[PDB]
Amino acid sequence: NEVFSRPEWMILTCLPVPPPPVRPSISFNESQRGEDDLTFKLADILKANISLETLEHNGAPHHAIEEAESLLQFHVATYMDNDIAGQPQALQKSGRPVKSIRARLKGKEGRIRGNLMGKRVDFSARTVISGDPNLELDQVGVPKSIAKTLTYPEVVTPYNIDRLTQLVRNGPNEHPGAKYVIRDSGDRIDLRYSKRAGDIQLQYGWKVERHIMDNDPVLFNRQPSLHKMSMMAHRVKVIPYSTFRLNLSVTSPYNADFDGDEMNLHVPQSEETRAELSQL
């Protein structure tokens, strides 16, 4: 394409250098410092470059230049891809091969399969499941500790204002309590440490990050997840003891038993998201 991809652009003449975010560094203790494999591979490209530049500038010995060119060719090439068929791998002192860019995107656990198409998440919780003849089909027994950690951001409104103020007063340690207060201003109030955690006076529009409570809709899931029924919306039921309790008849869709199975819990953060769960 004459605009976006002329064939002349396939060959590399100039090299875009990625910024630190793409190749982070870490400064440990003044005699320990960690650089990313790319920063290594780049330095080789550079060194090989600086070398070949000096050779061309000086008396070009033809065959000592093309010798230095196919070194540069290697470093640049091995930087984008280190798993090249026929070629030797660029290795990093310890004997391990350099993590090329290709290789960061490639596999499951790559940037695609493992950071975009699936990623770990916050408002998640996991524990051993156990059955209960006294839970209703659609509910899920949630351990007090798990309820006390997972939070729902509720907007201060005339309807909830008084209730919310009470959970705020209750605080992070009591069971129907709250963890944070989010002001209009954007800054987060930590009820655990704020000197004003007592005398906290709410304003319509603020958000109270309150504990997960009985009858909140939550996504319950048993992995693998080869089913839409492997992830279903349940009513919370805060209970004692460290296990997620489920109604026995709901065992089959998840494909769960109580021989040591664990299950995942995800908490929606929006009125919209909650509706999605409860309604679909």
Partner: protein, 183 residues
């Protein structure tokens, strides 16, 4: 078991030899060093709390010591030497001249940077105080796992093959049978 420092050790309070045994166990030292207890077991449908591979335990028996166990975890730490000048230190860090302190408490530390054995600990608390001077100094201390707690069993101070001061801390808990507990 009482004389060795291993990461993790699980010991049964009252082990029992099995009532039903193999002639081959004689050689396996099993009756001398057992892996369980002979429980009074009913195969019954009761409250339906034993459905799909779950079981009901006699809470009365659990109190009497049925299936309790000891638990020992061992935390280690080195006093590393980073070249000609930089040396880590065992001490109780002061929050004014020490960066990035742990929110946990440092009060249980004696001035040598260790908790004396016998003190009861708990989550996020600081077992071993360490700083990595760089300039005044950052905090390199060891806190107890946040999901655990117990009482410090033993604490030993040593030097290694080349003579780096390093310290091992044992923490003992007693794990009573609970709900999601596998058998």
């Amino acid at each position: 078991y009482n004389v060795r420092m291993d990461t993790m050790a699980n010991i049964l309070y009252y082990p029992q030899k099995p009532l039903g045994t193999t002639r081959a166990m004689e050689y396996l030292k099993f009756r001398e060093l057992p892996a369980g207890q002979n429980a009074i077991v009913a195969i019954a449908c009761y409250s339906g709390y034993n459905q799909e591979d779950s079981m009901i335990m006699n809470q009365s028996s659990i109190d009497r010591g049925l299936f309790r166990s000891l638990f020992f975890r061992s935390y280690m730490d080195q006093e590393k030497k980073y070249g000609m000048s930089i040396t880590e230190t065992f001490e109780k860090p002061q929050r004014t001249n020490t960066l990035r302190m742990k929110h946990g408490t440092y009060d249980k530390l004696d001035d040598d940077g260790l908790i004396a054995p016998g003190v009861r600990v708990s989550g996020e608390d600081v077992i071993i105080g360490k700083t990595t001077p760089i300039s005044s100094k950052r905090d390199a201390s060891t806190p107890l796992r946040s999901t655990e707690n117990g009482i410090v069993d033993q604490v030993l101070v040593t030097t290694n093959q080349d003579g780096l001061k390093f310290v091992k801390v044992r923490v003992r808990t007693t794990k009573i049978p609970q709900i999601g507990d596998k058998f």
